[PDB]
Symmetry: C3
Subunit: 389 residues, 3 copies
C-alpha cells in the first residue's frame, strides 16, 4: 500500500543520513593533522552514539511531544519518522564536531554534544517543526511554525543551530596554536588526508539526497524535482567556487570547492520542494560564493574554524532560509502573505535561531569553561590529541 | 504489487550487505600496520569473490536444496533471496579475514575461505535456516530449526560461525611477532589508519540495517521497529563502551568504542524482529561491555585477535542468541515452549554451532597446516605481507 | 502506483551512481603518489560538478531532444530519468579522469571534461540511446539504435567513450616521468593508498548495481536476474584474475584483481538484462582475463595508463558489446536478425564509437595542445601536482 512504501522510503532516507554521518567523519578526519585525526574520528563516533541515546531517551519527547524512551505506538509512520529525526539530531551535533578540532578536550566536547542533543536542538525543532509529525492527525505546531516560518529539511533547524553552537565553542576555546600571528598574519594548517575529505564530501552529497527525500514527507511525482534541486544546488556551488579559484593551486582550492558543494547543499536544504531548477542553481551558486567569502572573512577575523562549519552550515543555512522567501513559489506560503512579509518571517526565524542557538550555548559553555576548562594544555596541542588530554 | 516491492527491498538490502563488505575492508585495513594493509585489502576482495563463486556454484544448493550453478526458477522472490544469502556467505568469511591479519599466508587464507564457503557455513545454514526459503511453498526445515532454534539475521549462522573458525585459525597459526612477551606482559600494535576504521564501522552500521531489513522477509509496519532496534543496539553498545573508557586516552579507546558498536549490532542481529526498544538498548549495551571484557580476556589469554573478531562476532553472537530467549516476546516462540525451554534450545544451537564451526575447522586446518604451513616465515612478518610470502 | 515506485527506484539508482562517483574518486586517489592524490581528488570533484552543469544546461537537450536548462515537464518519469542520465555523463568523464593522472594540467583536464560533456558523450548517446526516453510516447531513435545496436547500460555509450578519449589524452600528453626507459624497460609506480582503491572498487560494485537496475527501465520479477548477473560478472572477473595471479606477491596483484572486478562489471553492463547467470560468469571471467592481458599489452606498448582505464573500460566495453551478440537471447534482438548479423551490427557500433570518441577528440585535443599545452612542466611533475602548475 501507500503506507508501506512511504515507510520504506523514510527508512532508506534515514540510512542515507547515516551515510551523511560517515561523510562528516571522513570530511573532518581528512582535514586535520595526523596527530589529531584519530581523536576526530573518536569524537565523530561518540557524538553520534550519545545523540542517538539522548534523542531516544528524551529528545523525541521534547521535540515532538504534547515519547520518553520511545516504543511502538498506534501511528504507523511514527517509528520511521523517529529514526529519521534521530538521524537529524546526530547530524546537528556532528556539524558541531568539525569546528572544534585539534584543541578541544574530548569530555568537554561530549558535554557540548549532550547540551546540543538535550536542550538546544529539541527546543528549536519543537519551535520550528512541532506540528510536522508524519502521519499524526492532531499535532499542535510550534510558535515559529504557527507564525509562518518554513524550513523544508532544516537549513535553520539542523545546519544553522549546529553552526551557531560551533561558533560559540570556537569563540570560547579560541584558535589553534600557530594559526594567527600578529607579525606574519594568517598561517594555513593543511590536512593530511584530503582525498578522504573528498570522499566524505561525496558521501555528504549522497546523504543530502536522503535528507531532502525523507523531509519531503509524501510520495508523488514531484519528489524527483526535490532530488534534481539537491543535485543542482550542490554541483552549482562547487562549479561557482571552481570558477572563482580557477588558476589557484591545489591542496588549498580543494577545501574551498568541497565547502562550496556542501554550502550549496545547505542552502537548497531550506527550499528544495518549492523552487525550480534555475532557482536551485542560483541559490547553490550564491551559497558557494558566500562560503568562499565567509571563509576569507573568518580568516581575517581571527576566528579558527577547521573545516569551515560557519561558512558552510551557518552562512549557507542563513542564506537558504532567507532565499526561500526570494525564490520559492507563493503557493507554499500562508495565503495572504506576500514576498516581503515572508522575508520578515524567515528573518525572524533566523534571528530567533541565532539568539537561542548562540547566546544560550555561549553563556552555558562559558560557565562550564570557567569551572571545567575545555581547551587542552599546550603540550597536548603540540603533541597531538590522539595521545591523551 | 507486493511481490515487486518485496523484491526491490531484498535487492536494496543485498546492496547494503555489499556496503557491509566495504566497511569490513576499511575496518580491517585501517587496524593493521602500513606494511600489511594492502595484503589485508587484497584478502578482503579475494574472499568476497571466492565466496560469491562458491555460493553460486554449490553453496546455495547445499544450504537450501532438497540449485547447482543457480539460474532463474519459477519462484519470484528466490533470485533476490539467493543474492541476499550469497552476501551473507561472503559476510561470514570476511569476518574470518580480520582475525588472521599480518601473519597468515594468502593462499592458506584462500583455502580457509574455500572451507568456510564450501562446507561449514552452508551446512550450518541448512541446519538453522533450511526452511526459510523466501516465497517457497513446501520447504523442509533443518533439524535445529525444527527443534525450535530462532535466529533472525545470523548472529549464530553468520557471526558466530565466522568467529569460531577465526578463533580456530588464530589458535593454529599463533600470535604475531612482538605481541606477547614473558617479561613485560602485553604490547599493543596500533593500526595506521584508524579514521578508516571509523568509516568502516559507519558503513558496517549502514549495512547492518540492510542485514536486518532483508532478513525480515516481509513488508509491513513493523519493519521500522527492526530498524529502530538495530540503531539502538549499535549506538547503546558504543555508548556503554564510551562510558567505560570515558577518561582513557585516544588511539586505543577508539578500537574499544567501534568494537562495542559492532558487538551491539551482532547481539541485536539475533532478535531484532522480536524485542522492544528498551530490550534492544539493554542487549546492545551488555554486548558492548562483554566485547570490552572479552578483548581484555583475550589479551590475558595470549590469543592474538587483530581487530577483535572473537569479542565482537563470537561473544556478541553467543550473547545475542542467548538473550533472544531472555528478552523476546513469547509469541515468536514455538507454542508450548516457555522462557527456560527456549533458553535450553538456543543453548543447544550455540553448542552445536561451537562444535561444528570450531572443532571440524580446527582439525581440518591443523591437518592442512601439518602438510602446508599457513604461517609466513619470520622475515616476511618482519618485512611485511605487502611484499610477498 | 507503478509510476511512483518506478520513480523512487530510478532516484535510488541515481544515488547509487553518485556512490560510483565516490568509488571512482577513491580508486584514482589511492592509485597515485601522495604528491598527486589531492589534485586527483580535486579533479574527481571538479569534473563531476562541470558535467552536471553541462548536462543540465545543454547535454540532456543534445542527447534526448527532438530540454535546455531542464525544468518540470508533463512526463512523470522524465525528471528521475534526467538525474540518472546526468549521473551517466558524470560517470563517463570521471572514467576519463583516471588515465591522465600525475602529468596533466588541471585547466586542460577541465577543458577535456567540457569537451566530453558537451560534444562527444551527448552526440553518441543520442545516436545509440535517442529513443530511450523513460515514459515518453513518441521518441525517434538514433540511427545506430534504429540499425539494431543494443547497449543495456552503456558498455559502449559510457565506458568505451570515456576509454577512447582517455586513450587519446594519454597518447597526446605522453607517459609519466621515470615510467619507461630504454635500458631497463618498464618501471612500476605504485600508489600510496591501495586499501582506498579496494574501498573504491567495492563502492563501484555497489553503484554498478544501481547502474544496471536503473537502466532496466521497468519493475518486474526479472530485475533480480539483472542484479545477479551484475554480481556474478564482477566476482567472476575478480576470481579469474585471482586465479591468474595466485602466487604473485601483493602490492601489484591487488591492482590486477580490482581491475578484473571492474572490467567484468564493464562487460556485463552491455547485456545484463538478456543473459543467463552462466553467461554472466563467463563474460565477466573473460573480461577479467582480457583486462590482465590488455594491461600487459599497454605496458609493452609504452602507453601509460595510471589506473588502467583502457584495459577496464575500453577493452571491457568492446568485449561486452561484442559478447552481447554471442551470449544474449535471440528474443532481445530485432526480429529477423540472426546471431552473426547482430555481431556485425554491434561491431558497427564499436567502430562508430571508436571513430567518433577517439579520432575527433584526438584531433581537437591535439589542436588544443598545440596552442595551449596540457602536460605540466617537468618541475611540476617532479615536485607534485598538489602544489600548483
Amino acid at each position: 500500500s501507500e503506507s508501506f512504501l512511504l515507510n520504506l522510503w523514510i527508512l532508506l532516507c534515514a540510512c542515507l543520513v547515516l551515510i551523511m554521518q560517515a561523510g562528516f567523519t571522513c570530511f573532518e578526519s581528512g582535514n586535520v593533522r595526523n596527530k589529531n585525526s584519530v581523536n576526530v574520528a573518536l569524537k565523530n563516533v561518540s557524538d553520534f552514539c550519545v545523540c542517538a541515546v539522548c534523542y531516544w531517551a528524551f529528545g523525541y519527547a521534547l521535540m515532538y511531544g504534547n515519547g520518553f524512551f520511545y516504543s511502538t505506538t498506534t501511528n504507523s509512520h511514527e517509528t520511521s519518522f523517529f529514526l529519521f529525526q534521530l538521524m537529524f539530531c546526530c547530524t546537528s551535533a556532528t556539524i558541531i564536531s568539525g569546528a572544534v578540532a585539534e584543541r578541544m578536550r574530548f569530555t568537554g566536547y561530549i558535554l557540548v554534544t549532550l547540551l546540543a542533543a538535550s536542550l538546544i536542538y529539541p527546543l528549536f525543532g519543537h519551535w520550528a517543526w512541532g506540528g510536522r509529525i508524519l502521519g499524526s492527525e492532531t499535532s499542535t505546531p510550534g510558535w515559529l511554525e504557527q507564525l509562518g516560518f518554513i524550513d523544508f529539511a532544516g537549513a535553520t533547524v539542523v545546519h544553522s543551530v549546529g553552526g551557531w553552537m560551533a561558533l560559540a565553542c570556537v569563540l570560547i576555546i579560541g584558535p589553534r596554536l600557530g594559526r594567527f600571528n600578529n607579525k606574519h598574519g594568517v598561517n594555513q594548517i593543511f590536512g593530511d588526508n584530503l582525498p578522504l575529505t573528498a570522499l566524505g564530501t561525496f558521501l555528504l552529497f549522497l546523504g543530502w539526497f536522503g535528507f531532502n527525500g525523507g523531509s519531503y514527507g509524501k510520495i508523488d511525482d514531484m519528489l524527483s524535482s526535490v532530488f534534481v534541486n539537491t543535485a543542482l544546488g550542490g554541483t552549482f556551488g562547487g562549479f561557482v567556487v571552481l570558477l572563482i579559484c580557477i588558476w589557484q593551486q591545489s591542496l588549498l582550492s580543494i577545501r574551498f570547492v568541497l565547502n562550496g558543494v556542501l554550502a550549496g547543499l545547505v542552502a537548497i536544504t531550506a527550499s528544495a520542494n518549492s523552487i525550480s531548477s534555475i532557482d536551485a542553481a542560483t541559490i547553490g551558486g550564491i551559497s558557494g560564493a558566500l562560503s568562499f567569502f565567509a571563509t576569507i572573512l573568518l580568516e581575517k577575523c581571527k576566528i579558527d574554524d577547521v573545516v569551515s562549519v560557519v561558512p558552510v552550515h551557518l552562512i549557507g543555512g542563513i542564506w537558504g532560509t532567507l532565499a526561500l522567501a526570494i525564490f520559492a513559489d507563493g503557493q507554499y506560503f500562508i495565503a495572504g502573505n506576500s514576498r516581503v512579509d515572508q522575508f520578515l518571517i524567515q528573518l525572524l526565524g533566523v534571528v530567533t535561531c541565532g539568539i537561542f542557538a548562540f547566546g544560550l550555548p555561549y553563556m552555558l559553555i562559558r560557565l562550564l569553561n570557567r569551572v571545567y576548562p575545555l581547551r587542552v594544555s599546550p603540550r597536548v596541542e603540540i603533541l597531538g590529541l590522539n595521545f591523551g588530554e
